[PDB]
Point group: C2
Chain length 214, copies 2
């Protein structure tokens, strides 16, 4: 069902700190969240922060339990991400969560560096984030390593791309219904409406493990 979402994103990009706070709601397969910067507007494209703005809200295939919600009741998990952009920019993000009754509170530490002055994040030319399909592999030690390529679409129609990897670290064994004989995939897409002071987004996540058609 539904849960309240609360989040704080803090860190710095190329040396300048920034902070956002906000929240929203999420259900199986969909979440909406709004956040606002504190003290000043972002010095870079807010689209760079869409992925920083809750794996718990994905729909799972019949037969597989939502491992993130299960973990929330069993010690939890953290996610550590690294995004490597084609122009050398690197975004490193760490996600930590605290749970309260009917509420998930995110604490996001985001460090970006190596972004050149000519980067689209400074020209403010990104107009939207394109969908992704992530590959997830359960590995020894209660870990899931995931990987996927990502693209932002720019004003002129060309793309600004990145290679992303995530290491989801669970406190306790990942639910047994999540098969360990192969990987699963997560399709993600967002609908963004941002300014350098107020970020708003709707996100749809779907975990699947078979071709879409027969």
């Amino acid at each position: 069902t539904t849960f309240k979402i609360e989040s704080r994103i803090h860190g710095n990009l190329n040396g300048e700190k920034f902070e956002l706070v906000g929240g929203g709601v999420g259900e199986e397969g969909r979440l909406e969240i709004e956040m606002k910067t504190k003290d000043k507007p972002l010095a870079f494209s807010p689209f760079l922060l869409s992925t920083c703005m809750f794996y718990h809200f994905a729909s799972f295939p019949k037969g597989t339990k939502n491992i993130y919600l299960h973990a929330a009741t069993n010690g939890g998990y953290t996610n550590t991400r690294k995004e490597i952009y084609e122009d050398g920019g690197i975004l490193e993000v760490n996600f930590r969560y605290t749970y309260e009754f009917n509420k998930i509170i995110g604490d996001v530490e985001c460090i970006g560096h190596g972004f050149p002055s000519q980067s689209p994040i400074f020209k403010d030319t990104i107009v939207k984030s394109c969908p992704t399909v992530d590959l997830m592999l359960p590995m020894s030690g209660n870990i899931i390593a995931s990987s996927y390529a990502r693209a932002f679409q720019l004003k002129d129609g060309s793309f600004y791309t990145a290679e992303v990897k995530n290491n989801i670290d669970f406190k306790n064994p990942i639910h047994e219904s999540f098969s360990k004989s192969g990987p699963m995939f997560t399709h993600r897409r967002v609908e963004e409406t941002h300014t350098k002071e107020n970020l708003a987004m709707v996100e749809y996540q779907q975990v699947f493990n078979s071709a879409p058609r027969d």
Copy 2:
């Protein structure tokens, strides 16, 4: 849509040349192919050659034309792949095709290097290729750049992984029905039955551009 397939794979891995010849059949969404080595058995795991063993046989979403089959009618295309394995192994592959009435003849150049002695491909511990979901981006200059992570499952249940990138070079414009405002995805899975002398497999490919569920 049943076409005859023929192929020849030639190259070398860590300095030793190898060659395979064979063929099979393909249709929208499915292909089957068998090949045998020439002169000697493979000096490494045959599973490393599954991906070397025809994008034309993918099923496309309603409203989008099969761009590979269309290209076959207007100048063609080539594909250049690079697979980077987690242990340093690098597989570089170039795909070229020639068309006859109802037949596609592939000529594949496969160069592998940097694989350490302890690699699963020499221990022969790979038991199967896991499914993948590729992200495809049309770029300027009649090109499609694709990327995805790939995994082999080993005898003990653990995985041997690689990051893969592909550059599909079309002689002429990619069919217009293939939207350029965003990426499309291709889910691929294979069923393998290999020996170091005879390789056989069935492959299912499905292009899609929306979440698998509502």
